Design a protein around this ligand. Structure first.
Ligand SMILES: C=CCNC(=O)Nc1nc2cc(-c3cccnc3)c(=O)n(CCC(C)C)c2s1
Length: 193
């Protein structure tokens, strides 16, 4: 397996997300959402909240275990490795195609954050920013799609709502929410089995 950096994604985005139109833009949402859904399917977390922010960015929040907060080689956080090496995989592809991205992790009584800019270059390490109850766990990913790559950077509420509805139906017993801060629209989906 040949590992690559984020420049490879930026030079051939269609190879990773199919296209650079609205379909590709929304693939970025699906990758992040799917990672939160995988975590819930494994039994960690019973709600997944998606927000379309007024500035054009998009946030996904889960209440799963929290991405690992430790280090890989050479003092590099595991989360930085997840977000910056392409195993050619969604997290690194979204980072590559974002003008900025923030990941916030909560676990073990601590809240940590790392910020990337300009196609996924870290501008901070994984920094402890605060504290939380020892019981509190999860991951939050916010990203701004790169307007230099996509033909449209307008997330579509109806498109996202349909996909989260479907994902709630497949998962069971997990609430998926969508809030649009541009229009104030909001919806929740939950299917009990
Ligand atoms: C909110 C937006 C998106 N949501 C997520 O990405 N949520 C996640 N939760 C976890 C929990 C654990 C994990 C496993 C084993 C033990 N403790 C934590 C973990 O390894 N991951 C990395 C999996 C791959 C992305 C490397 C994640 S990714």
């Amino acid at each position: 397996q040949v590992l690559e950096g984020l420049d490879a994604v930026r030079k051939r985005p269609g190879m990773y997300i199919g296209s650079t139109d609205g379909a590709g833009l929304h693939h970025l949402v699906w990758e992040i959402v799917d990672n939160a859904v995988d975590e819930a399917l494994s039994g960690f977390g019973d709600r997944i909240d998606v927000t379309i922010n007024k500035d054009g960015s998009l946030t996904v929040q889960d209440h799963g275990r929290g991405m690992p907060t430790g280090m890989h080689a050479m003092g590099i956080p595991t989360v930085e490795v997840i977000f910056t090496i392409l195993h050619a995989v969604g997290s690194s592809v979204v980072n590559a195609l974002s003008s900025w991205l923030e990941v916030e992790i909560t676990r073990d009584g601590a809240v940590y954050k790392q910020r990337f800019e300009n196609g996924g270059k870290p501008v901070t390490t994984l920094k402890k920013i605060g504290t939380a109850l020892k019981s509190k766990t999860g991951t939050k990913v916010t990203f701004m799609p790169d307007a230099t790559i996509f033909s449209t950077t307008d997330f579509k509420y109806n498109t996202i709502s349909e996909r989260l509805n479907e994902s709630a139906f497949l998962l069971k017993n997990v609430t998926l929410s969508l809030t649009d801060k541009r229009t104030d629209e909001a919806i929740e989906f939950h299917y009990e089995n």
